[PDB]
Amino acid sequence: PNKYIVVTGGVLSSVGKGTLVASIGMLLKRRGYNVTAVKIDPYINVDAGTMNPYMHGEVFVTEDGAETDLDLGHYERFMDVNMTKYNNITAGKVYFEVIKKEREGKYLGQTVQIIPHVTDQIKDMIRYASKINNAEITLVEIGGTVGDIESLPFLEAVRQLKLEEGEDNVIFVHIALVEYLSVTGELKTKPLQHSVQELRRIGIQPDFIVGRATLPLDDETRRKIALFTNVKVDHIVSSYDVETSYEVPIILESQKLVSKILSRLKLEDRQVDLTDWISFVNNIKGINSKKTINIALVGKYTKLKDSYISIKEAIYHASAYIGVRPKLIWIESTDLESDTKNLNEILGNVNGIIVLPGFGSRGAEGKIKAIKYAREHNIPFLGICFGFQLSIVEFARDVLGLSEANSTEINPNTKDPVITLLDEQKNVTQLGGTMRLGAQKIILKEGTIAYQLYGKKVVYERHRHRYEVNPKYVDILEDAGLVVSGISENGLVEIIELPSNKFFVATQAHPEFKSRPTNPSPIYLGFIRAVAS
Amino acid sequence: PNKYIVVTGGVLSSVGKGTLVASIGMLLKRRGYNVTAVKIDPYINVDAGTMNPYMHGEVFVTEDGAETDLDLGHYERFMDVNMTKYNNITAGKVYFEVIKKEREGKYLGQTVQIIPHVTDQIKDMIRYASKINNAEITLVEIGGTVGDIESLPFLEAVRQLKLEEGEDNVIFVHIALVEYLSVTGELKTKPLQHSVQELRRIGIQPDFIVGRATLPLDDETRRKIALFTNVKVDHIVSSYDVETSYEVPIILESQKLVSKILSRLKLEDRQVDLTDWISFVNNIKGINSKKTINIALVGKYTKLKDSYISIKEAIYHASAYIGVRPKLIWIESTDLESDTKNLNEILGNVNGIIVLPGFGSRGAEGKIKAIKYAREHNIPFLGICFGFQLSIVEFARDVLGLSEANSTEINPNTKDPVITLLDEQKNVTQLGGTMRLGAQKIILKEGTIAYQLYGKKVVYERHRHRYEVNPKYVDILEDAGLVVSGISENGLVEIIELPSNKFFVATQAHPEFKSRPTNPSPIYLGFIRAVAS
């Protein structure tokens, strides 16, 4: 029926797990062939919407409002597709489903076990992601270390998928970190011979191999591992360090890995033109760069590579599109928390400022000062989510003059709950508000920066927030010069702006999730143009 | 502070897992020691309440209303304790709890995993069973096959359990099926070597072996598995076929297993008297039997050993007590559905008839005929659960002449719903009724067989049913001769009887769950006394 490429290994992000699947996806898509990607996470969390972006990375949001693993973000950007809740499978969800069906007697008195009941849920979920996304081919990216307990049910599941569907429709691509000894030049097989066995032990035979390394693999090395892994030298392929993830697809066709792949399934097609992707890439490397802009980004977890991967990638798409070289100045919001130590030299240099999503109160003054600074010194500024909310707070305590304005999230007790939880229609409540998630509608006001940026009245961005602008405060804020240029169908404020400034925009939503290399977020476009002057 | 004996292996019932554990238990308790036993079922069902007793066996019921693995029944019968919901730990319940706690953000933004979140949950549950029961020693019986997926997390948890508290507080008894090849006399170690291999991979070193075999183990064959498994011969011990599992403690005391164990755990006591138990065993084996009595058991699943294990044991306990030898005549109830094929011969020989629990409708008529027959020929009869409900029916459509009388479970359309679901007071309803579970008060009527059997007015039996006697029909059922000797706190009919017969008693509850070697169910005592005249 369908085809299936199963990928394992990774075990890290330095290894390129997600991008390789995304790359492979993109190359198939250009060949007429319909494709979809699916990521499996063998952890117990039902989904990613309670997970700390620290230690774990950004939480991606699909158009349908699922909170997922960032890997779907790689998929969306590379294959230019909309993901769904079904493209991210977690042990958490599977276990929940099986337990619920048992409790409902849907198993008719059987004793429900891993095999086959759990393994069957996995296959139903894989196969379902195939049919609802209309795919002839389906990548299944399997997280974790092969041979870890958590991985077994998913490995066994795909081993079975191979007995059922046949070798002419199910293949495995494994990703191994080659790394020559610290002081010898000879490679450490130990992890690598440790893997191939665990796969055989679980009953899986790799067809293609991707060795991850700084530098391509010599002729020798590749013939060596070819042995341990029992794979044909013809089918081992290289993943070497590279200046941008977007190159990955191009190094893969220079090796034709997807050609080898397609045959191995018994399909046929060719003549892919990347010229359009190729130029996008060269624009990413700074080639024919018209300038260099510094953007300060202010939040926490800033040392984590993937904590804000989508904002970062959206900055790249906007820049690359208008030919400009982004330089990112990450600033921990605490390093700003000093009525002492001044900052008109820390951000005197940057040509634009962004206050990051993500809440609590860890560094909310640092973030608020950075905003005050952007607004007062007319530095182009973009507010996202918690950032947008601190704009309301900053504007109210400084321009409006409410010294006590705050979010109830930070101080549930403030005299002026300028940001707060709301109920479906009343609207103020310390209940538990209404969490907005996914693609939602935003009605732009004509004449504003927002309307211009989008070039139309009605648009959509993905949401992931619960704290809203208090409606009681809206009007006196407008009177103080703040403009609501965006509201929800039911009147919640979506986009604020200050026309008095060259570029001052904030938004509850996350437009970065929609950014594509060939289709940058419009919000991020306006910001990056303003920034670049 | 707590000692733990972890018991692995016995991939099934004939291998003796349940009883071995149960025997070691009872032998400990007879010494100074506070002891409990815990059964782990690596399956995904949350509890045993949804399960078909075919394939899997009889569902046990605790005093507390838990629906559980039948192994808790062995623990009760052998050690003479009431078990709790905590003494049956399921993979279904662990995952349910962990997942729920995650969805509750109890894991504070962490990515929740098998290790350590699942293994922690399991440890918590094992530890909790210990303390709520108040044990200094806790037997942890781990079902399934060592080295299978569903088992890992529990094996991993018991490894951690050890490296934590010490080699002096946590030991491993592994049960291996010793089975010499078909035609050569030498033993097939293949599965055995494969198991001690699956344990080291998991990092578990067995301390004692128990080789399950037909005959005791010779000097040669035990010495050998001692090597394969790296265990001192002095710590290998034989489990061989015996007439009754109640013999197992005895053969373990001969081999002094529990004495070898007590040391390896650095504890000291002794002088145990089994004289009271030896005698009970001899009665069970029929030594000095006063006569043999034939009992028919009518129901379904009669070909599986453990589908009604507790009903049998209750029969054995009462028979042994009054010094008589029971022979059970298993009768599929379909073998009696026959407007031909008369029966004053199939049942002509039996002096006792019990109609079995287990609803549905498969062989409902056969069970009904059986009930007509014992009532009419005055064969002492015991009806139980769906048996009781059928008695009520038979009585209706025959003596009381209501040809359409029936339970709503068998035909919700019947003209006379003499048995049906009832809502929380009212009481007639086809909603979903009110499920009765575990120990429950029953008020006995004075001057009845039931009152006589208990020698008191207020008593408890464990329940497991929803379909009750329709209150409307009570009053006429009574006038036609039926006696209600038992009702609930709120007037639901619990026990009935027909004083016109020498013994014809049916009860909603399951009195067999409480029966002990020393302390027979008063209901089973009565029945067996009546049967034997």
Residue B431 — φ and ψ, nearest 5°?
Answer: -55, -100
B396 with B527, same domain: the answer is yes
Q: Is A149 annotated as a binding residue?
A: yes
Q: Which residues of B touch A113 (CB under 8 A)?
A: 42-44, 150
Contact across the interface for B149 and A150, Cβ inside 8 Å: no
Distance between CA atoms of residues B496 and B518, nearest Å: 26
SS3 B201: helix
The candidate with the shortest Cα–Cα distance to A153, out of A182, A110, A112, is A112
Residue A154 — φ and ψ, nearest 5°?
Answer: -80, -40
Distance between CA atoms of residues A281 and A320, nearest Å: 8
For chain A, list residues whose CB is within 8 angstroms of any CB belonging to chain B: 43-46, 50-52, 54-56, 92, 95-96, 98-99, 102-103, 105, 107-115, 117-118, 148-150, 152-153, 156
B208 with B327, same domain: the answer is no
Which of B59, B94, B99, B121 would best serve as a mutation to test chain A binding (most A beta carbons within 10 A)?
B99
Distance between CA atoms of residues A37 and A126, nearest Å: 10
Q: Which residues of B touch A103 (CB under 8 A)?
A: 46, 50
Name which of B50, B95, B103 is nearest A109 (Cβ-Cβ): B50
Contact across the interface for A156 and B149, Cβ inside 8 Å: yes
Respond yes or no on whether the N-terminal peptide bond of residue B288 is cis (omega within 30° of 0): no
CA distance A144 to chain B (A): 11
Yes or no: say if A206 and A229 are a contact pair by the CB < 8 Å rule.
yes
Q: Which residue of B has its CA nearest to A152?
A: B149
Tell me the catalytic residues of A: 385, 510, 512
B281 with B309, same domain: the answer is no
Contact across the interface for B111 and A153, Cβ inside 8 Å: no
B114 with B239, same domain: the answer is yes
The candidate with the shortest Cα–Cα distance to B511, out of B473, B460, B450, is B460
CA distance A16 to chain B (A): 20
Q: Which residues of A touch B108 (CB under 8 A)?
A: 52
Neighbouring CB atoms inside 10 A of B474's CB total: 18
Distance between CA atoms of residues A386 and A402, nearest Å: 19
Contact across the interface for A112 and B43, Cβ inside 8 Å: yes
Residue A464 — φ and ψ, nearest 5°?
Answer: -160, 65
Distance between CA atoms of residues A117 and A132, nearest Å: 22
A25 with A15, same domain: the answer is yes
Domain boundary among B222, B255, B288: B288
Residues 6+ apart with CB under 8 A from A277: A26, A246, A249, A250, A517, A518
SS3 B55: helix
Name which of B46, B110, B114 is nearest A103 (Cβ-Cβ): B46
Structure tokens at A290: 């018209």
Distance between CA atoms of residues B244 and B263, nearest Å: 29
Neighbouring CB atoms inside 10 A of A11's CB total: 19
Q: Which residue of A has its CA nearest to B150?
A: A114
Distance between CA atoms of residues A64 and A71, nearest Å: 16
Number of domains in chain B: 2
Residues 6+ apart with CB under 8 A from A490: none
Distance between CA atoms of residues B437 and B461, nearest Å: 10
Yes or no: say if A379 and A502 are a contact pair by the CB < 8 Å rule.
no
Q: How far is CA A299 from the centre of its chain?
A: 17
SS3 B145: coil
A27 with A99, same domain: the answer is yes
B247 with B395, same domain: the answer is no
Contact across the interface for A112 and B44, Cβ inside 8 Å: yes
B434 with B307, same domain: the answer is yes
For this entry, resolution in Å reads 2.5
DSSP string spanning A392-403? HHHHIIIII--T
* Rounded-to-10 torsion of CA A453, A454, A460, A463: -10
Whose tokens are 């008593």? That residue is B459
Q: Is B188 annotated as a binding residue?
A: yes
Structure tokens at B511: 């009195």
DSSP string spanning B246-286? GGHHHHHHHHTHHHHHHHHTT--------HHHHHHHHHHTT
Distances (CA, A) of B337 to B190, B343, B403: 48, 10, 17
Strands A381-384 and A353-355: parallel
The candidate with the shortest Cα–Cα distance to A239, out of A225, A251, A231, is A251
CATH number of domain containing A431: 3.40.50.880
Distances (CA, A) of B31 to B80, B170, B252: 14, 19, 15
The candidate with the shortest Cα–Cα distance to B206, out of B185, B164, B175, B180, is B175
Q: Is the dihedral of CA A303, A308, A310, A313 positive or negative?
A: negative
Which of A45, A56, A152 would best serve as a mutation to test chain B binding (most B beta carbons within 10 A)?
A45
Distance between CA atoms of residues B279 and B281, nearest Å: 5
Distance between CA atoms of residues A68 and A80, nearest Å: 17
B270 with B370, same domain: the answer is no
SS3 A236: strand
A250 with A379, same domain: the answer is no
DSSP string spanning A189-213? HHHHHHHHHHHHHHT---SEEEEEE
Contact across the interface for B56 and A111, Cβ inside 8 Å: yes
Q: Which residues of A touch B102 (CB under 8 A)?
A: 44-46, 50, 92
Distance between CA atoms of residues B176 and B302, nearest Å: 29
CA distance A49 to chain B (A): 9
Q: Which residues of A touch B43 (CB under 8 A)?
A: 111-113
Which residues face A142 on adjacent strands? A40
The candidate with the shortest Cα–Cα distance to B359, out of B390, B328, B331, is B390
Which of A95, A146, A151, A202 would best serve as a mutation to test chain B binding (most B beta carbons within 10 A)?
A95
Name which of B51, B103, B111 is nearest A56 (Cβ-Cβ): B111
- For B257-268, letters b (16+ CB in 10 Å) and e give bbebbbeebebe
Q: Which residues of B touch A304 (CB under 8 A)?
A: none
The single-letter code of the amino acid at B130 is S
For the purposes of burial, counting CB atoms within 10 Å of the CB of A431, is it exposed (0-12), middle (13-18) or buried (19 or more)?
Answer: exposed
Q: How far is CA A42 from the centre of its chain?
A: 18
In this complex, how many residue pairs, one in chain A and one in chain B, have their CB atoms less than 8 Å apart? 100
Distance between CA atoms of residues B410 and B335, nearest Å: 19
For the purposes of burial, counting CB atoms within 10 Å of the CB of A347, is it exposed (0-12), middle (13-18) or buried (19 or more)?
Answer: buried
Distance between CA atoms of residues A307 and B95, nearest Å: 29
Q: Is B18 annotated as a binding residue?
A: yes
Yes or no: say if A478 and A484 are a contact pair by the CB < 8 Å rule.
yes
- Which residues span the domain enclosing B134? 1-288
- Residues present in chain A in total: 533
Residue A429 — φ and ψ, nearest 5°?
Answer: -160, 140
Q: Which residue of B has its CA nearest to A153?
A: B149
Neighbouring CB atoms inside 10 A of B389's CB total: 29
Structure tokens at B133: 């029961």
Q: Which residues of A touch B116 (CB under 8 A)?
A: none
Yes or no: say if A9 and A175 are a contact pair by the CB < 8 Å rule.
yes
CATH number of domain containing A279: 3.40.50.300
Strands B458-465 and B468-469: unpaired
Residues 6+ apart with CB under 8 A from B262: B31, B268, B269
- Rg value, chain B, Cα: 25
SS3 A51: coil
Which residues face A173 on adjacent strands? A7, A208
Q: Which residues of B touch A111 (CB under 8 A)?
A: 43, 45, 51, 55-56
Distance between CA atoms of residues A88 and A83, nearest Å: 9
For the purposes of burial, counting CB atoms within 10 Å of the CB of A285, is it exposed (0-12), middle (13-18) or buried (19 or more)?
Answer: middle
Tell me the catalytic residues of B: 385, 510, 512
Q: In what order do the strands lie in the sheet with B468-469?
A: B406-407, B417-420, B468-469
Structure tokens at B323: 């010094």
Yes or no: say if B347 and B313 are a contact pair by the CB < 8 Å rule.
no
Distances (CA, A) of A490 to A465, A471, B112, B135: 16, 12, 37, 61
Strands B493-497 and B504-507: antiparallel
Distances (CA, A) of A107 to A93, B208, B435: 18, 38, 20
Domain boundary among A260, A288, A316: A288
DSSP string spanning B363-424? THHHHHHHHHHHHHHT--EEEETHHHHHHHHHHHHTTT--TT-EETTT-TT-S-EEEE-B-S
Give the residue ranges of DSSP H helices in A214-300: 219-228, 248-254, 257-265, 275-284
Domain boundary among B264, B288, B312: B288
Distance between CA atoms of residues A468 and A436, nearest Å: 10
B505 with B443, same domain: the answer is yes
Residues 6+ apart with CB under 8 A from B88: B38, B39, B41, B47, B48, B66, B68, B69, B71, B72
B264 with B371, same domain: the answer is no
Residues 6+ apart with CB under 8 A from A480: A395, A399, A400
* Rounded-to-10 torsion of CA A329, A334, A338, A344: 10
Name which of A45, A99, A113 is nearest B112 (Cβ-Cβ): A45
